[PDB]
RNA sequence: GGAGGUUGGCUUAGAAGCAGCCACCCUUUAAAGAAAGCGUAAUAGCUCACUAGUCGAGUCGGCCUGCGCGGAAGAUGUAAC
RNA sequence: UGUCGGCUCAUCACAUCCUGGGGCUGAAGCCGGUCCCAAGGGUAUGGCUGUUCGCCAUUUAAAGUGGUACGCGAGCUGGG
């Protein structure tokens, strides 16, 4: 946006678009406003290796305004001209080949996919194989809702027939018969199952050195200041036996999109005072990629240098045993902060240090004050058991936090 | 502002002033050092 | 803090150089970093020169042996006496270079048989 | 900048850090000055190096002198210093060597003569643990 | 102005006045602490300690003691000369 | 000189529960914590129990703390 441009989610976009080397066209959008100077964007983005095609040039800079409408035709010209410099070879006669954009189920017609055809042609009738699934295109819908008999080389269509709903990254390929399709499908899930176990052991920070290779890392800090401090510290490391270069780095929890970035770039997850979400956890489990949470700044860099020289492994330091989700708070005026909670992982016990985290970023760090159920002072609460908790010399524990409890392994 | 029965300087920019027959401490550095009464 | 006895010690000390100097000049140091003056003092020490800063009121009483006695009327502001007991002159080409280079002090006057200029 | 390099160590850029604290200068030219160190006694002796980048970007090498803490350490045996000076005195120091390092430390030391420089170094020695002796 | 040996020695990945321990010396000087405080991941940076000039007659704190000021909010109506 | 609780009817204090005006905050915002000023007006319905109290269910901007023969039987009740 012309007003207030370049913010810590635009840098994430530039990193994601650099991991896969692709051309970038910048379209400053909200020029129909008083405070809409673009030159501060022009040079603010320039310190991202996105220098404009007026000083040096690897990217254009065209101002549009979506709501009003001006400038669009220049943007279309710019994007087509950028495309012209790159490749773009396709044969509109070969058997079709493409990718699937999005799939959905429906009681009528069953499963539906939104294949984008990339090469060849997809006239209605072929034997399509898409990842694990296979079938015949018994019907086809175009973008605007009208049935079509043929599909171009780069025209998105929406087919019917597959035996299951496909994923959002698989390849549509035309084949000869269903038997070959079944053989290839069986082989495909065999290989896909086989890749995961190799990745979930060879991808650890412990074994990067063993088997350049430019060690890649993805970092999610808690406050920006620590983020630039740590990026600056990690800048100079790695000379001739592996090298380090961050491919991510933003403020917030470990979003699933960041896990996907690391998975595609074969990186490793560093989390500074942050926790991973449900989706990020599920992707970590699926792809078996490494992910380690750190408490202090220097342990991150000491592990990075140790693993760069590859001299030690192991886990130690901290192990989490029990996470309780705070349900409601009834802080009594007798100098208390009694917060009700229900344990969602493990077991919580008294003589441990606790860690109060809200929106996946830790806010406190200290021990407890009371962990009674009604008045029992159980000093140990099994999972699935509601209780009341109290943190020592701390308040402002809102409704929706979590109370992690961990052991500092010695 | 902190109201106490015994007010006194807490640093080297606190000043003692009597204002309308009330002893006050005002701080030019840290607003947390404001006191009344005493 | 200097006292009545402590203060008058330097007055006698300044007299000893005054009672043996030949040509001396008065200089100021308003703005001169100690680093620049450190080399100049050692260069003055190497070249057999004697420069010191004294109170503007102590100088007017220190000079009693007729060394730079005419400089009483100009002993205002920062002031450093550059005494040269040997080779009258000598400690003049340094100030001419320093003043033109460091933009420091008007060099006040000189002490050549009571010739201030 | 007032960092110290050790008789040629510019090959790495671990301690370069010429982004947060110093301007970005092509470290190769300073690495091209790593031979300008030329050691003198092994590639482990540190040296005082000051870079002039305040005006423009013409990086200049000062190479003032060597610290009179390694010298009193190296040139008197033990390569360490007493963690409790005057309580675990590592060992006495020969006088003329203190003059010898004072003689070589002609730059700086801001003294009228070496007769005051000898007394200057002993203060440094009195913290290392060396027993000053004439 | 407020500086040199000097990032004092040690520990430490890095401890440079200012994590911690041990000392706490010397030199050009008007004076400047191997440093009182804020900051740096460590550097850098900003003040105090002290000193020169400036204006020109008083100024700083402690002790004994007479009289006062806060500490001081209640129930039918001033309502503790 | 008729002693608990309930009902009807009240009146005052402020050591303020809500609404009102502010200082500090380990106060980004929305919500908070603590202290100062302020008594104009407001300030639940039920299940259990003889209960005041209490624990529960669902509300409310909030469901204040106390004095008045622990206000009120020549105003009612009579469960204890
Ligand atoms: Mg009080
Ligand atoms: Mg008033
Ligand atoms: Mg009195
Ligand atoms: Mg009184
Ligand atoms: Mg009244
Ligand atoms: Mg009633
Ligand atoms: Mg009424
Ligand atoms: Mg009354
Ligand atoms: Mg009040
Ligand atoms: Mg209130
Ligand atoms: Mg209020
Ligand atoms: Mg308020
Ligand atoms: Mg408030
Ligand atoms: Mg009221
Ligand atoms: Mg009232
Ligand atoms: Mg009321
Ligand atoms: Mg009223
Ligand atoms: Mg009233
Ligand atoms: Mg009115
Ligand atoms: Mg009711
Ligand atoms: Mg009720
Ligand atoms: Mg009943
Ligand atoms: Mg009463
Ligand atoms: Mg009573
Ligand atoms: Mg009562
Ligand atoms: Mg009664
Ligand atoms: Mg009552
Ligand atoms: Mg009755
Ligand atoms: Mg009754
Ligand atoms: Mg009766
Ligand atoms: Mg009666
Ligand atoms: Mg009756
Ligand atoms: Mg009865
Ligand atoms: Mg009956
Ligand atoms: Zn104060």
B1 touches strand F (CB under 7 A): yes
Chain A contact present for D13, CB below 8 A: yes
- From CA A150, how far away is CA B19, in angstroms rounded? 91
- Burial letters D14-25, b for 16+ CB under 10 A, else e: eebebeeeeeeb
Please, are residues A275 and A363 in contact by the beta-carbon 8 Å criterion?
no
Inter-chain contact A236–D20, Cβ cutoff 8 Å?
A: no
Report residue A323 as tokens.
Answer: 């996470």
Q: Beta strands A269-272 and A291-294: pairing type?
A: parallel
Q: What is the DSSP letter of B31?
A: G
* Whole-number distance in Å between D121 CA and E22 C1': 19
List of residues 6+ apart from A258 with CB closer than 8 A: A218, A220, A248, A250, A269, A280
Q: What is the DSSP letter of B13?
A: S
B30 touches strand F (CB under 7 A): yes
- The burial class, CB within 10 Å (0-12 / 13-18 / 19+), for C46 is exposed
Q: Are A and B touching by the rule of 3+ CB pairs within 8 Å?
A: no
Strands, E, within B1-38: which ranges?
Answer: 2-3, 14-18, 23-27, 35-36
- From CA A122, how far away is CA A140, in angstroms rounded? 10
According to the annotation, is A33 in a ligand binding site? no
- In degrees and rounded to multiples of 5, residue A219 shows phi and psi of -120, 135
According to the annotation, is A18 in a ligand binding site? no
**What is the strand order of the sheet B2-3 is part of?**
B2-3, B35-36, B23-27, B14-18
DSSP characters over A187-256: HHHHHHHHHHHHHHHHTSGGGTTT-----EEEEEESSHHHHHHHHHHHHS--SSS---EES--EESSB-H
* Whole-number distance in Å between B3 CA and F40 C1': 28
**C to D CB pairs, distance under 8 Å:** 4
- From CA A399, how far away is CA A379, in angstroms rounded? 23
* Selection from B36, B26, B25, B33 nearest residue B3 by Cα: B36
Distance from CA of D124 to the nearest CA of A (A): 33
- From CA A300, how far away is CA A218, in angstroms rounded? 12
* Whole-number distance in Å between D15 CA and E1 C1': 34
Q: Report how this structure was experimentally obtained.
A: cryo-EM
| Residues written for chain C | 117
Please, are residues D92 and D128 in contact by the beta-carbon 8 Å criterion?
no
Inter-chain contact D110–C38, Cβ cutoff 8 Å?
A: yes
Tell me how far CA of residue A121 lies from CA of A2, A113, A117, A142, in angstroms.
42, 17, 7, 14
The residues with which A405 forms a beta bridge, in sequence order, are: A354
- From CA A405, how far away is CA A350, in angstroms rounded? 10
Residues of C in contact with D110 (CB under 8 A): 38, 42
Query: Strand, coil or helix: what is A264?
Result: helix
- From CA A239, how far away is CA A318, in angstroms rounded? 31
Distance from CA of D2 to the nearest CA of A (A): 20
* Selection from A4, A50, A2 nearest residue A24 by Cα: A50
Strands, E, within C1-117: which ranges?
Answer: 25-27, 50-53, 80-83
3-state percent helix, strand, coil for chain B, nearest multiple of 5: 10, 35, 55
Ligand 1 centroid – CA B38 distance (Å) = 8
Please, are residues A119 and A90 in contact by the beta-carbon 8 Å criterion?
yes
* Whole-number distance in Å between A378 CA and F57 C1': 28
- From CA A204, how far away is CA A215, in angstroms rounded? 11
According to the annotation, is A389 in a ligand binding site? no
D68 touches strand E (CB under 7 A): yes
- From CA B23, how far away is CA D111, in angstroms rounded? 57
* Selection from A292, A129, A134, A113 nearest residue A218 by Cα: A292
Residues of A in contact with D27 (CB under 8 A): none
- The burial class, CB within 10 Å (0-12 / 13-18 / 19+), for A266 is middle
D51 touches strand E (CB under 7 A): no
Please, are residues A230 and A270 in contact by the beta-carbon 8 Å criterion?
no
- From CA C88, how far away is CA C6, in angstroms rounded? 31
Report residue D128 as tokens.
Answer: 């290392």
Question: SS3 string of A35-96?
Answer: CCCCHHHHHHCHHHCCCCCCCCCCCCECCCCCCCCCCHHHHHHHHHHHHHCCCCCCCCCCEC
* Selection from A47, A113, A118 nearest residue A87 by Cα: A118
Query: Strand, coil or helix: what is A133?
Result: strand
- From CA C74, how far away is CA C56, in angstroms rounded? 9
Nearest-10 crossing angle of helices A297-309, A224-235? 30
* Whole-number distance in Å between A223 CA and F24 C1': 26
Tell me how far CA of residue A136 lies from CA of A83, A118, A123, A236, in angstroms.
33, 18, 11, 55
- From CA A135, how far away is CA A131, in angstroms rounded? 11
Rg of chain A in Å (alpha carbons): 27
Model resolution, angstroms? 2.9
The residues with which A217 forms a beta bridge, in sequence order, are: A246
- Burial letters A6-29, b for 16+ CB under 10 A, else e: beeebebeebbeebeeeebebbbb
Chain D contact present for C48, CB below 8 A: no
- From CA C42, how far away is CA C25, in angstroms rounded? 17
- The burial class, CB within 10 Å (0-12 / 13-18 / 19+), for A304 is buried
CA angle (A242, A247, A249) in 5-degree steps: 125
Rama region for D103: left / alpha / beta (φ>0; ψ in -120 to 50; rest):
alpha
Ligand 3 centroid – CA A187 distance (Å) = 102
* Selection from A397, A377, A400, A381 nearest residue A336 by Cα: A397
Q: Beta strands B2-3 and B35-36: pairing type?
A: parallel
Residues of D in contact with C45 (CB under 8 A): 112
- From CA C54, how far away is CA C5, in angstroms rounded? 16
Ligand 34 centroid – CA A307 distance (Å) = 90
Distance from CA of A288 to the nearest CA of D (A): 33
Residues of D in contact with C42 (CB under 8 A): 110, 112
- From CA A85, how far away is CA A371, in angstroms rounded? 66
Distance of CA A224 to the CA centre of its chain: 19
Strands, E, within A273-371: which ranges?
Answer: 291-294, 317-329, 339-345, 348-349, 354-358, 361-362, 368-370
Please, are residues A5 and A28 in contact by the beta-carbon 8 Å criterion?
yes
Please, are residues A270 and A292 in contact by the beta-carbon 8 Å criterion?
yes
Residues of D in contact with A235 (CB under 8 A): 19
Query: Strand, coil or helix: what is D89?
Result: coil
Which residues in range 92-131 of chain D are in contact with strand E, contact meaning CB within 7 A of any of its atoms?
A: 105, 108-112, 116, 119-124, 126-129
Scanning A269-324, the segments in alpha helix (DSSP H) are 278-287, 297-309
CA angle (D108, D114, D118) in 5-degree steps: 95
Residue of A nearest to D20 (CA): A232
């Amino acid at each position: 946006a012309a007003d207030d441009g370049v913010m810590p989610q635009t840098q994430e976009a530039v990193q994601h678009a650099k991991a896969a080397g692709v051309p970038i066209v910048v379209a400053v959008n909200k020029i129909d406003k008083p405070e809409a100077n673009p030159d501060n964007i022009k040079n603010g983005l320039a310190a991202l290796d996105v220098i404009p095609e007026e000083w040096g040039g690897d990217a254009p800079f065209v101002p549009v305004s979506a709501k009003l409408g001006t400038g669009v035709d220049e943007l279309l010209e710019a994007v087509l001209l950028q495309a012209e410099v790159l490749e773009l070879k396709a044969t509109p006669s070969a058997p079709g080949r493409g990718v699937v954009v999005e799939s959905r189920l429906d009681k009528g017609r069953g499963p539906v996919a939104t294949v984008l055809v990339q090469d060849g042609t997809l006239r209605q009738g072929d034997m399509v194989l898409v990842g694990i699934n296979y079938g015949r295109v018994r019907a086809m819908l175009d973008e605007n809702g009208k049935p079509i008999k043929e599909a171009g080389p780069s025209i998105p269509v929406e087919i019917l027939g597959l035996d299951g709903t496909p994923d959002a990254g698989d390849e549509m390929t035309v084949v000869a018969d269903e038997k070959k399709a079944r053989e290839v499908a069986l082989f495909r899930q065999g290989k896909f199952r086989e890749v995961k176990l190799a990745r979930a052991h060879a991808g650890k920070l412990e074994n990067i050195f063993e088997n350049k290779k430019t060690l890649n890392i993805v970092l999610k800090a808690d406050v920006r200041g620590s983020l630039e401090a740590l990026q600056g510290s990690l800048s100079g490391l790695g000379n001739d036996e592996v090298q380090v270069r961050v491919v991510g780095g933003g403020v917030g929890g470990i979003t699933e999109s960041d896990a996907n970035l690391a998975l595609a770039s074969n990186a490793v997850l560093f989390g500074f005072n942050v926790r991973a979400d449900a989706g990020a956890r599920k992707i970590v489990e699926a792809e078996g990629l490494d992910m380690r949470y750190y408490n202090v700044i220097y342990d991150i860099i000491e592990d990075v240098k140790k693993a760069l020289t590859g001299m030690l492994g192991s886990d130690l330091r901290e192990n989490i045993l029990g996470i309780a989700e705070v349900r409601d708070v009834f802080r009594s005026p007798k100098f208390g902060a009694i917060a009700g909670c229900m344990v969602t992982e493990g077991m919580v016990h008294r003589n441990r240090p606790i860690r109060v985290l809200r929106d996946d970023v830790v806010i406190f760090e200290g021990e407890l004050e009371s962990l009674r159920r009604f008045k029992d002072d159980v000093a140990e609460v099994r999972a699935g058991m509601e209780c009341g908790i109290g943190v020592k010399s701390y308040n402002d524990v809102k409704v929706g936090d979590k109370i992690e409890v961990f052991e500092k392994v010695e | 502002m902190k109201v106490r029965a015994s007010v006194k300087k807490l640093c080297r920019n606190c000043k003692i002033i009597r204002r309308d027959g009330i002893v006050r401490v005002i701080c030019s550095a840290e607003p947390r050092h404001k006191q009344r009464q005493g | 803090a200097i006292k009545l006895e402590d203060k008058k010690a330097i007055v006698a000390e300044v007299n000893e150089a005054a009672k043996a100097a030949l040509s001396a000049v008065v200089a100021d140091a308003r703005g001169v970093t100690v680093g620049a003056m450190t080399g100049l003092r050692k260069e003055a020490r190497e070249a057999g020169v004697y420069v010191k800063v004294v109170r503007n009121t102590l100088l007017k009483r220190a000079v009693e042996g007729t060394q730079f006695d005419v400089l009483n009327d100009v002993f205002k502001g920062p002031t450093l006496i550059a005494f040269s007991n040997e080779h009258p002159g000598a400690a003049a080409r340094i100030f001419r270079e320093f003043a033109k280079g460091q933009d420091k002090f008007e060099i006040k006057a000189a002490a050549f048989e009571g010739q201030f200029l | 900048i007032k960092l110290q390099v050790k008789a040629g160590q510019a090959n790495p850029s671990p301690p370069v850090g010429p982004a947060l604290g110093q301007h970005g200068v092509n470290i190769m030219e300073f690495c091209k000055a790593f031979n300008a160190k030329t050691q003198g006694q092994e590639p482990g002796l540190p040296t005082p190096v000051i870079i002039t980048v305040y005006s423009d970007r013409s990086f200049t090498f000062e190479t003032k002198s060597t610290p009179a803490a390694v010298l009193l350490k190296k040139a008197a045996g033990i390569t360490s210093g007493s963690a409790r000076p005057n309580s675990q005195k590592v060992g006495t120091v020969t006088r003329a060597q203190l003059e010898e390092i004072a003689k070589t430390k002609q730059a700086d030391l801001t003294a009228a003569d070496l007769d005051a420089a000898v007394r200057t170094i002993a203060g440094s020695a009195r913290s290392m643990g060396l027993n000053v002796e004439g």
